[PDB]
Amino acid sequence: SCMVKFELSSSKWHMTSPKPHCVNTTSDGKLKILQSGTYLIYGQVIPVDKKYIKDNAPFVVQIYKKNDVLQTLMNDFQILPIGGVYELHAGDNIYLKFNSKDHIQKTNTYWGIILMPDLPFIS
Amino acid sequence: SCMVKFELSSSKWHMTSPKPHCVNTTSDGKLKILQSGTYLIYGQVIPVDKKYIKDNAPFVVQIYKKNDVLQTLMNDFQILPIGGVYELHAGDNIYLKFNSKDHIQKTNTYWGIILMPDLPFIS
Known part of the structure; x- marks a missing residue:
């Protein structure tokens, strides 16, 4: 069993x-994969109320695996909500990228991964 | 360990x-929580290209918990990507509602839950 959750409000991993x-996890909220396998990457990114964002800069969140974009959301x-089921390899660095970090409300923003169990049964 | 994943292409739960x-899972893609606990609800809903949209309905996905909306996405x-971490109780029906089924590319659309382990170790 292997799961971690990063709480941006405190910059702690649970x-x-x-x-x-x-x-492995770092205090910046990034991860390095040690075990190759199928992972569920998850989280919720809370934007600042648009009422308070007074330019045309879009709210964008990307998830990267090493130097490759896994997904782009806006x-x-x-x-x-972010993430999904991805096949990852020992050595992969996983991290988020924001169009502007000033768009992000720290309160109630979180992300993480869980190493998935095999799902060999089908109904 | 408890995880299920509904594949919309096949209407099968893995x-x-x-x-x-x-x-408990059903072939309509609904589920009912049997064990009270902290769950990660997840999935990805993939839209068809807008060039194929015939109707006038906006792209909206809702997750229901019993008879009330838990999450509205658009x-x-x-x-x-859908979901997040939720406390759910034995007896909670969870299901997705789409504004229009014709919006959805079934092939890579999936959703499910996983019962989360405790996360007692912080830093």
Whole structure:
């Protein structure tokens, strides 16, 4: 069992074990994958109320795997769930990128990963 | 360990177990929580290209918990990850509502839950 959750409000990771086998984490909210496997990347990014953003800069969130974009998301400054199921390899760095970090409300913004169990049964 | 994943292309649930203890799943793509706990609800809803949209309905996805909306999601027909971390209770029906089924590219659209382990280790 291996899961970690980063809370942007505190810049703390919450973890299943003292030292998770599947991942290393840093205080910037980035991760390095230690175990190759299928991961669920998740989170919610809370934008500042658009009422308070007085330019035309879009609200964009990207998730990167090393130097490759895994996904790019944008909405009109509404709560943004992120991630999905991705196959990852030992050594992969995972991290978020924001069009503007000033768009992000720290309160209730979080992200993380969980190492998925195999799903061999089908109904 | 308890995780399920509904593949909209096939209408099949992929499962950790022959009979997952935490959840009852149905072939309509709905589920009912059997074990009270902290869950990660996840998925990706992939829209068809706007050039194929015939109707006038906006791209909207809702997650329902029993008879009430837990989450309302919307964008301009772009990739939509869904969900987040939620406390759910035995008996909670969870299902997705789309504004228009014709908006959805079934092939890579999926959703599900995973019962989360405790995250007692912080830093």
